Amino acid sequence: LAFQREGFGRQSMSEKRTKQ
Amino acid sequence: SFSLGLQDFDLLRVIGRGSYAKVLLVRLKKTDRIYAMKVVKKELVNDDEDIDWVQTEKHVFEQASNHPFLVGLHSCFQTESRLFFVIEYVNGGDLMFHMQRQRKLPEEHARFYSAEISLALNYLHERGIIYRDLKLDNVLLDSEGHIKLTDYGMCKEGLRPGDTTSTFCGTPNYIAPEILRGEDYGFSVDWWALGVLMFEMMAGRSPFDITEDYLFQVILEKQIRIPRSLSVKAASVLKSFLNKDPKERLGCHPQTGFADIQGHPFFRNVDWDMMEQKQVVPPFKPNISGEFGLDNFDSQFTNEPVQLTPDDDDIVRKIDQSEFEGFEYINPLL
Ligand SMILES: [K+]
Ligand SMILES: [Mg+2]
Ligand SMILES: [Mg+2]
């Protein structure tokens, strides 16, 4: 509810790192 | 060869995942010692920028061995499809899991955790490293209740005290305004992220709770108002870390920065030198239950099949294997 692991806005990202 | 390999380990359990890696609980067979194992797929390593972050993560991991509140490295090795970091296992679970179970922490507990995180960050900064991914999931609790930061893949290394960089990166909830505005930035973005995390611990929710375009807009525009039940000193420290101007934000002045943190009224009861020696007893003691303390890890991970995902041979056979030459490492201090 309050905190969702990997939920909206909670995923790490980078313009210089390939994801997925 | 001195180096260890995958066949030197027993795979016990999956304990975590993020955007870039899978993390397993492992046993080093010859010593019967337990470690965590971070696994990165080589197919994700496309360009030089991907090689950069892997090499940076390894190097910060190496330096981490010198500080009590950073996760240290035992060994590194690779297979055809993957890169492996064997690192110390911290079995109290992470602060994301802690917050889900506790809902909200007393000011004393947040003070303790934030002071230990502050010392970890300062150690990195002193050494020219911006951390760049502080979040609840990346702060681990050890058996005794002290913390350790993990996950060094977002780090920028090699910055002299006044230097800046400009990569758009981080976790959206925690990303500083100067990044979102496209400015060159320094160590300031870590202090902002700590402000967010502290608000999370003491209020039980993100201060920016609410498409990511909208979240970015909120971060850039909202002025945070502190819940009235928090003390003046707790309110003061949150507002100062969450200053949208990096030149005025607590901890960010190039001369007085870390001193300003140490001397803030919120941190008055902290003996910083004793703390950095783990001579302050933590306010909470983790319960180590289930095999290896695995009850402190989300069951969505610990219920996963204990496996490395089968390779696509067609993809693997095209991988340039020379770009990871000399990746093999063993920590000579055991
Ligand atoms: K360490
Ligand atoms: Mg890239
Ligand atoms: Mg992570």
Residue numbers in the entry:
A (entry chain B): 1 to 20
B (entry chain A): 246 to 455, 466 to 589
According to the publication:
Atypical protein kinase C (aPKC) is a key apical-basal polarity determinant and Par complex component. The atypical protein kinase C (aPKC in Drosophila or PKCι/PKCζ isozymes in mammals), its binding partner Par6, and the small guanosine triphosphatase Cdc42 are three essential determinants of apical membrane identity in both Drosophila and mammals (Fletcher et al., 2012, Harris and Tepass, 2008, Hutterer et al., 2004, Izumi et al., 1998, Joberty et al., 2000, Lin et al., 2000, Wodarz et al., 2000). aPKC isoforms PKCι and PKCζ have regulatory regions distinct from those of other PKC isozymes, but share a conserved catalytic protein kinase domain. Like many protein kinases, activation of aPKC requires activation-loop phosphorylation and an αC-helix conformation compatible with Lys-Glu salt-bridge formation to bind ATP and serve to align residues within the R spine (Kornev et al., 2008).
To understand how Par3CR3 could inhibit PKCιKD-2P, we determined the 2.0-Å crystal structure of a longer Par3 peptide (residues 816–841) bound to PKCιKD-2P and Mg-AMPPNP (adenylyl imidodiphosphate). It engages PKCιKD-2P by adopting a “staple”-shaped conformation with two arms that flank the S827Par3 phospho-acceptor site. Each arm binds in close proximity to opposite ends of the nucleotide, suggesting that recognition of aPKC is driven by nucleotide occupancy. Par3CR3 contacts extend from a pocket beneath the ribose-binding pocket of PKCι (site 1), across the G helix (site 2) through to the activation loop, αB and αC helices of the PKCιKD-2P N lobe (site 3). The amino-terminal part of Par3CR3 binds to site 1 (PKCιKD-2P kinase C lobe) through an F-X-R motif at positions −9 (F−9) and −7 (R−7) defined relative to the phospho-acceptor (P site) at serine 0 (equivalent to S827 of human Par3). The phospho-acceptor serine-0 hydroxyl hydrogen bonds to side chains of D378PKCι, K380PKCι, and T416PKCι, preventing a catalytically competent orientation for nucleophilic attack on the ATP γ-phosphate. We define this portion of Par3CR3 as the “inhibitory arm,” as it directly perturbs an active PKCιKD-2P N-lobe conformation (discussed later). Crucially, the R+5 side chain is buried within a hydrophobic pocket beneath the regulatory αC helix. The pocket is lined by side chains from Y265PKCι on the glycine loop and W298PKCι of the αC helix, each making π-stacking interactions with the guanidino group of R+5. Overall, the structure reveals that the Par3CR3 clamp involves an “inhibitory arm” and an “anchoring arm,” which together recognize and inhibit a nucleotide-bound PKCιKD-2P conformer.
